[PDB]
Amino acid sequence: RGKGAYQDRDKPAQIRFSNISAAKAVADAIRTSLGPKGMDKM
Amino acid sequence: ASLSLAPVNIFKAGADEERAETARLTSFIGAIAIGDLVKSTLGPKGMDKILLSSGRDASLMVTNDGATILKNIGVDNPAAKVLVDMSRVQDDEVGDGTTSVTVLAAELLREAESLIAKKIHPQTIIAGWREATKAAREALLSSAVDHGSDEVKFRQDLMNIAGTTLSSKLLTHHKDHFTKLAVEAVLRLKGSGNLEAIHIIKKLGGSLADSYLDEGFLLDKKIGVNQPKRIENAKILIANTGMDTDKIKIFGSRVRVDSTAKVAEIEHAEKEKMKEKVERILKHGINCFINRQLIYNYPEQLFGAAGVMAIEHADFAGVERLALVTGGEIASTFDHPELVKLGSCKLIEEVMIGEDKLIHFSGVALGEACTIVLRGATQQILDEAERSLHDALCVLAQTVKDSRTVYGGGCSEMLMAHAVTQLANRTPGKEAVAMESYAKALRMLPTIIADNAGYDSADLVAQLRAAHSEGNTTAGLDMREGTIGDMAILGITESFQVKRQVLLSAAEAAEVILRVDNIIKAAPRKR
Amino acid sequence: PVNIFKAGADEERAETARLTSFIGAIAIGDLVKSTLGPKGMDKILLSSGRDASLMVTNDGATILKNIGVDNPAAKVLVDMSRVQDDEVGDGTTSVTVLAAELLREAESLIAKKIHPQTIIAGWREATKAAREALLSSAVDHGSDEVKFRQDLMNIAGTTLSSKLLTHHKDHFTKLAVEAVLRLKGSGNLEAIHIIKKLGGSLADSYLDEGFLLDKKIGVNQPKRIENAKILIANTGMDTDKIKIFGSRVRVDSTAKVAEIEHAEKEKMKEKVERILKHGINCFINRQLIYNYPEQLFGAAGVMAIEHADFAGVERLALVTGGEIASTFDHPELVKLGSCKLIEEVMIGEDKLIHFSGVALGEACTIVLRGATQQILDEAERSLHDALCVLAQTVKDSRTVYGGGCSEMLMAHAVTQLANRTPGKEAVAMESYAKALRMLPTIIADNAGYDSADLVAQLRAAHSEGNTTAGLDMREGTIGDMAILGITESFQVKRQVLLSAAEAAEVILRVDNIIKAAPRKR
Amino acid sequence: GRPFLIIKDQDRKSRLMGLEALKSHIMAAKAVANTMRTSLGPNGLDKMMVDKDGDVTVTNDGATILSMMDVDHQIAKLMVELSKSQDDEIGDGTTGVVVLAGALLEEAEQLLDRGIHPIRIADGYEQAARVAIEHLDKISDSVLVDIKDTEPLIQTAKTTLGSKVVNSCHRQMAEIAVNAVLTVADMERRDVDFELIKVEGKVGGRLEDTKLIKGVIVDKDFSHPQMPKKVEDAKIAILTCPFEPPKPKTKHKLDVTSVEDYKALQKYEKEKFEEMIQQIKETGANLAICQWGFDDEANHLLLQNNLPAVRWVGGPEIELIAIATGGRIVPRFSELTAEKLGFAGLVQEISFGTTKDKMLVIEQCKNSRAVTIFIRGGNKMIIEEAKRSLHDALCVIRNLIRDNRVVYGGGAAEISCALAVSQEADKCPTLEQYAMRAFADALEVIPMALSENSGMNPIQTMTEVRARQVKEMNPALGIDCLHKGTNDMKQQHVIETLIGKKQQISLATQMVRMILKIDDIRKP
Amino acid sequence: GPLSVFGDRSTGETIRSQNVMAAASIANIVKSSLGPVGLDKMLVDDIGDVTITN
């Protein structure tokens, strides 16, 4: 393809991965909240 | 993907890391700090600084060359340590251009950070600089010229290079008084290294003009009473023997007697054993003596009974120098009074040097090792004088080793820039901009030289690019004034080997430091 | 050689001061350079002492609004962005990044020991020439309705590229256009109403054919009215205190007090009948009202609306054809507001009163049924910016070319000037021109294209004289926006360049930063 | 019942158990694997780091990087241990195996959130490693290496130096390494001990100076610096005792009851000295190789005897001199004879010019057994980098002592093994296809990170290369390692070890199977 | 972690077991005040008020 933009910027990758990882964390935390047999939280 | 901090603490106290452009920023900030710390001193009109310690008598030493500067300072970023180490390596190799290689590396990294800010694959830059440096090496060797076919021209080139070195440091202020003198010293080398064979003596006071190289040899010790006070045409034998206690090689021996008369007998026996040893040595019939170890009181009295000159304990370097200059031997066995060669000299006598005493050794057999007398207004002057002259001696020895030289500073640089530019014309694709950035990086050096001089830079660089583009490969910046002139007549000859080595080392260090991707500091070793 | 400052008072009178200013400026520039072009990505302003208040924004105005600094130059640029956003809208990003590039040029120039006044004069002349050239290229329209409408569509569509709402550009840009049509050539900005109602989609939003009100109604008011004769009032109606004071009730029996109460009830009824003499089917009260007036109005049976808003009543007086009254002796000297139907509407989970078939439609009401409060806030910011741009382009009909077209035009003009200029200034101006070249470059960087190739092609095209050449952001090619439809406001770019010029002028002429000793905190 | 102290000091007592412990494991391990990404195999960068005492050391020899870290979590220390194991086994893929492990545990954490016991994942990984190694052994090609042909080995080392800065010269090192291995190898035993090679380096010079010396280097100068400096072909002797008179290793008290005893001892001292001189001069050996130093009398006597010698020479260097010279060890002059002497090719003194070091080399005309490698470069960082790189190269050659020790690498092996794993896994019942497919994905992780490190557009690169190597089957179609097109690896010829990749696969599979099991945790 | 910082969390039958913990606890105290026949328990306030209850 030839040389070009090396994408020397990857901090936005760290922020995006951090946010999405936190999102899976918070979503996983309450995965026991719904269902006709679901459990609840106090 | 790049993420090593969000999940959990994978580090103990004081342990961190930085993956993204932050690491590059840190390294480049350190590198530019190094460069400005050093680029403010490069060039024949380069500048000077002062290194001051933190407490503890505040060690003071003046220096122009940046080697000791990077040694003393506490560099923090790993790239900074890498730079100070490349500086120490270039310093040990030859010297007088360590500053140059440091500045060149820093400036290369400046264009490197710029181009990576233009989002470029580092491997491409590395390959481009490798090919460009190979081509530049070939061109510069093609420009290398051999000499030494005669004496007058070669000697003139030696004074030229000596004075050129003296420009980079402070010695320029009296460089003439140094130059020819220095030449003579390198003449006495006659095909051997170990500058330690060259001796340098400093005493506060006098003047730089008062400094001179001895027309003979010098020694700094003291002599006994029963020894004479003035001698000539001495015959010299060197020794490294134990004559203080006559310690017998067997340990465990002990006297088991009862009457103290036997003790007097055995002590007289020991004294006569020492007397017979002195007879064994004196059987060689030497006129002067040196022993590497201590001359004890009984040996000294026996020598005084003989009444000849004997020199007490000294070092290894002194005895080696004396063996060189007089052609004696360091003897530790004396059953062969005629199977040894005696050192030769013509006059040995003290000279009251101001507030000091030094013995004058004229008419020595071999004029190989030499003693240099230094005097100055401050001891810092003496320290930097010795440093700079050691650098000059290293360069002189290196150019005696190989007589391949090139034209003066920048001009060889600028023609290499011209050749690399011509390749840039031949260079297609993306590597072309990297290697032309390499080229202007090289071209930056004479600009900094002009800035250190105190003259306009852009006009000189553009005009001299025009001059070197027309084939006038001998013109260049004038050393006397901010003008342009041929250094062949001006007399600026540049040692090809030293700066080809400088270019190679700078290229290697730059590519190594550019190959980085990640800085991870470990713990600070909690106290 | 002697200390002269107070504890905490600092003065840097060397290049370290400009160094600090420049690094702060660069820290400003890179933070916002990701919010430009059609490829921008939004940012977060996270708080910890503000009780965890966050706002997401793309136009860097709010970004510079919510961040302070000790380096005074960065605050200077923050105020510059304030000014820029005070003028029209988006371009704060543009002017700030441009200032960053020009100060980087200044860095490179100071790297050659040059007295800055030469730079100052050269940039003065370059700016004069560039403004003259751009004015000579000022393309104008409005002589035709279709041409002017399409120019507005092009400007709006190009502007929505810089923000999020592009996803439904055809459902947004065009809509915004009609809003400024409703201004009827009036210079007012404060007629458009901004409404945020979380829930629903940005495509579920719409522009109603009327007006809406969000205030409680009286105790007994009809729910729907037709052909409403509308009046707007601002008086007491709260047992209508006499406004006279230093007067006291001082009697010896309470029968007189009873008669006074009966008399005040009668006087309030008299005020009500005074109002009713004019004859209306809908009443408006900017403020509250009391139970007895409410009973009187219910006896009348009309619509009384209570506790309205000053700006809103001004807007509605502009809209429905009436004006606010406070005295009612003249059933003959007042113009009455008019509407077709006034009904009830339930939007989100909030209750609104709907004006349908209003006699006029000057003011505007934009309901946003978005999906989050933060997206709603940034949507309202973006529409505010877009309507400001629309109003400005309606004001002055002259337009210009974006995609770097006008930018490389001035770049090449300055190039030729520097070529015909001797001295350092030329290359400085050339570098200045190079500085301008960085602006479209960063745009391509937002796209991540073959940067140098594109820049070379644009410079070649502008040297050839193709004065409509631009960058295709749909694919990464070079084309003509006259085909594509990428047009912007002449006023916008003109003031962007002029403000950037004067900001550079003031910033470069600094020599010593002195931070006073902090008071305390 | 009121809570009561059952466990000693439950106050400072921290317990984790269950799926959350696995979450902590996976997150830490993914962070580490992504930390160690950008040095993959034939092409990459180098990570620089400083340790506690302030030493700069940079390389892609990943084991060193992981070793010199003051890490906190246990799994990372386990990773460091695995890296050290793989380095001491082969010396390449020091980051490849850890990135593979990270990929495997990525797959494990994905499938974990699907609600399956870790035993299933470990079993799937084990079966997939079985299949992968089996096919990797089916695909490797035997290399017929003899004592006169070296070009395949030269290209092997040349490719191995990829991503390792020593690829500057990239040619001479392969030749000198092959020559050293041939000289020192024990062919019948197939054994090469690296204690026979004095891997040395000195700063300065250039990487062009990287040379192999068919002999020994010694770092001690003349006992008599005035003595003549260089000798051609010579005969040496190795004496393990000084020149001092023989005193026993038992405490001895030699009485002296008479003056004539004093005369007898002062005569016997010298008599022993010159007796030793006559003994050593009779045997005719030019050189003496001692260990403990001696007295100046011997120095001056040898000056009058013109017989060179050295002193204080250390143990291992003494042994290496003896090995190279072909002689035997002479404890004392009783064993001294003309037979056991060692013949010298030529011996010379250098000082590296500007330096004040002194260093003697021994180059042998006759057959030698212990060779020496010298390095010239930019700094101690350069010296250590060259040392570790060439040492890993020697490990590679020692592995390569046998045939079929090479398969096409550069990532192509990863595509091939991933394809084989997918093909085998597809024809299986359920509950296993998921784990096996996960292993397959972990397999093509390596080419993805490879293309990333090269800076190539990754996903299209892997797609096109996979299509090319699927439609026509060959072990040589890997992605561009020299980045110049010609992805057919029968042209670039990435020539790297078989057992290296096999051991990396085995280590990663066993290690992930191990880590999958730690489900309940306890810290203070 | 789960992004529930500045606090504490628990789960499993353990906490369900701990749900027994307090409850069964409060049983034992009152375990001598049952129906027809029981024994009274003594309470002393911080002020020291003397109080009895059954």
What's the CATH number where D492 sits? 1.10.560.10
Say if residues B518 and D47 touch (Cβ distance below 8 Å). yes
Name the structure determination technique.
Answer: cryo-EM
Residues facing residue C342 across a β-bridge: C225, C355
C380 C-beta neighbours (distance < 10 Å), count: 16
Chain A residue nearest residue C449, CA to CA: A5
Homologous superfamily of the B222-359 domain (CATH): GroEL (3.50.7.10)
- d(CA B13, CA D36) in angstroms, rounded, equals 21
From B411's Cα to the closest Cα of chain D, the distance in A is 25
Containing C126, the helix (H) or strand (E) segment is helix C116-136
Alpha helices in B283-410 (DSSP H): 297-306, 316-326, 379-401
Domain ranges in chain C with CATH number 3.50.7.10:
216-353
E-assigned strand segments in B132-207: 198-204
- d(CA C42, CA C65) in angstroms, rounded, equals 16
Residues 6 or more apart whose Cβ sits within 8 Å of residue D353 = B193, B397, B398, B401
**Torsion angle, CA of C224/C226/C229/C232, rounded to 10 degrees?**
30
From D109's Cα to the closest Cα of chain E, the distance in A is 15
Q: Which two tokens stand for residue C125?
A: 């002349």
Tell me: do D348 and D376 sit in the same domain: no
Residues written for chain C = 521
Which CATH number is associated with domain B16-146+403-523?
A: 1.10.560.10
Of D113, D455, D457, the CB nearest to A6: D455
Say if residues B515 and D165 touch (Cβ distance below 8 Å). yes
Breaks (C-N over 2.5 A) in chain B follow: none
Chain D residue nearest residue B498, CA to CA: D205
Provide the CA A24 distance to its chain's centre, in angstroms. 5
Query: Among D293, D164, D286, which Cα is nearest to D232's?
Result: D286
Tell me, yes or no, whether D10 lies in a domain.
no
Alpha helices in D7-60 (DSSP H): 19-35
Neighbours of chain A (3+ CB pairs under 8 A): B, C, D, E
Tell me, yes or no, whether D4 lies in a domain.
no
Q: Which amino acid is it at B20?
A: A
Which 3 state secondary structure label does DSSP give D58?
A: strand
**Torsion angle, CA of D99/D101/D104/D106, rounded to 10 degrees?**
-60
Catalytic residue among D59, D64, D95, D461: D95
Flag whether A touches C (3+ CB pairs, 8 A cutoff): yes
User: For this structure, is D146 an active site residue?
Assistant: no
Residues 6 or more apart whose Cβ sits within 8 Å of residue B1 = A13, A17, D34, D37
Tell me: do D83 and D168 sit in the same domain: no
Q: Mapped to the 3 state alphabet, what secondary structure does D364-391 carry?
A: CCCCCCCCEEECEECCHHHHHHHHHHHH
**Resolution of the entry in angstroms:** 4.4
**Which chain D residues are Cβ-neighbours of B323 within 8 angstroms?**
225-226
Catalytic residue among D94, D160, D210, D509: D94
- d(CA B59, CA C185) in angstroms, rounded, equals 80
Tell me: do D170 and D87 sit in the same domain: no
Domain ranges in chain C with CATH number 1.10.560.10:
10-140+397-517
Tell me, yes or no, whether D2 lies in a domain.
no
Which CATH number is associated with domain C216-353?
A: 3.50.7.10
Residues facing residue B205 across a β-bridge: B376
E-assigned strand segments in C33-94: 43-45, 55-57
Say if residues B341 and D227 touch (Cβ distance below 8 Å). no
Q: Is B225 on the interface with C (CB under 8 A)?
A: no
- d(CA D349, CA D333) in angstroms, rounded, equals 27
C517 C-beta neighbours (distance < 10 Å), count: 10
Residues 6 or more apart whose Cβ sits within 8 Å of residue D8 = none
Tell me: do D228 and D340 sit in the same domain: yes
Tell me: do D94 and D153 sit in the same domain: no
Say if residues B390 and B65 touch (Cβ distance below 8 Å). no
Containing D103, the helix (H) or strand (E) segment is helix D96-112
Tell me: do D254 and D292 sit in the same domain: yes
C355 C-beta neighbours (distance < 10 Å), count: 28
CA angle at D370 for the pair D364 and D374, rounded to the nearest 5°: 85
Residue B30, CA atoms < 13 Å, CB-side half-sphere: 19
Sheet holding C139-140, edge to edge: C139-140, C398-401, C487-489
Query: Among B482, B479, B485, which Cα is nearest to B467's?
Result: B485
Query: Among B18, B361, B58, which Cα is nearest to B221's?
Result: B361
Residues 6 or more apart whose Cβ sits within 8 Å of residue B69 = B37, B38, B49, B51, B63
The pair phi, psi for residue D521, each rounded to 5°, is -125, 155
Tell me: do D210 and D222 sit in the same domain: no
**Which chain B residues are Cβ-neighbours of C452 within 8 angstroms?**
433
Q: Which domain holds residue D132?
A: 19-142+405-524
Query: Among B137, B164, B158, B168, which Cα is nearest to B501's?
Result: B137
Provide the sign of the torsion angle of the four alpha carbons D428, D433, D438, D444, taken in this order: positive
**Which chain E residues are Cβ-neighbours of A29 within 8 angstroms?**
2-4
Residues facing residue D15 across a β-bridge: D522
C263-272 long-range contacts, Cβ below 8 Å, gap at least 24?
Answer: C264/C239, C265/C292, C267/C240, C268/C239, C268/C240, C268/C292, C268/C293, C268/C296, C269/C296, C271/C235, C271/C237, C271/C240, C271/C328, C272/C296, C272/C297, C272/C300
* Residues of D within an 8 Å Cβ radius of A: 113, 455-457
User: For this structure, is D426 an active site residue?
Assistant: no
Alpha helices in C371-489 (DSSP H): 373-395, 405-419, 424-447, 451-464, 481-484
Q: Which two tokens stand for residue B20?
A: 């993204």
Q: Is D1 on the interface with E (CB under 8 A)?
A: yes
CATH class of C10-140+397-517: mainly alpha
Say if residues C431 and C108 touch (Cβ distance below 8 Å). yes
User: For this structure, is D255 an active site residue?
Assistant: no
Q: Please tell me the total count of domains within chain D.
A: 3
Residue B335, CA atoms < 13 Å, CB-side half-sphere: 9
Q: Is B433 on the interface with C (CB under 8 A)?
A: yes
Tell me: do D110 and D163 sit in the same domain: no
Q: Which two tokens stand for residue C489?
A: 């406001």
Q: How far apart are the first and last CA of chain D?
A: 25
**Which chain C residues are Cβ-neighbours of B448 within 8 angstroms?**
none
Q: Mapped to the 3 state alphabet, what secondary structure does D350-364 carry?
A: ECCCCCCCCEEEEEC
Q: Which two tokens stand for residue B82?
A: 């890498």
User: For this structure, is D240 an active site residue?
Assistant: no
- d(CA B142, CA B260) in angstroms, rounded, equals 86
- d(CA B66, CA B41) in angstroms, rounded, equals 8
Domain ranges in chain B with CATH number 1.10.560.10:
16-146+403-523
Residues 6 or more apart whose Cβ sits within 8 Å of residue B288 = B231, B234, B235, B236, B237, B308, B309, B310, B311, B343, B345, B348
Tell me, yes or no, whether D14 lies in a domain.
no
Tell me: do D247 and D335 sit in the same domain: yes
- d(CA D215, CA D218) in angstroms, rounded, equals 10
Classify each residue of B421-451 as buried b or exposed e, where b means 16 or more C-beta atoms within 10 Å of its C-beta.
Answer: bebbeebeebbebbbbbbbebbbbbbbbbbb
Annotation-wise, does B421 bind a ligand?
no
User: Are C452 and B433 an interchain contact pair (Cβ–Cβ within 8 Å)?
Assistant: yes
E-assigned strand segments in B45-131: 49-52, 60-63
Residues 6 or more apart whose Cβ sits within 8 Å of residue D510 = none
Which CATH number is associated with domain C141-215+354-396?
A: 3.30.260.10
Tell me, yes or no, whether D3 lies in a domain.
no
The fold of B147-221+360-402 is: GROEL; domain 2 (3.30.260)
C237 C-beta neighbours (distance < 10 Å), count: 24
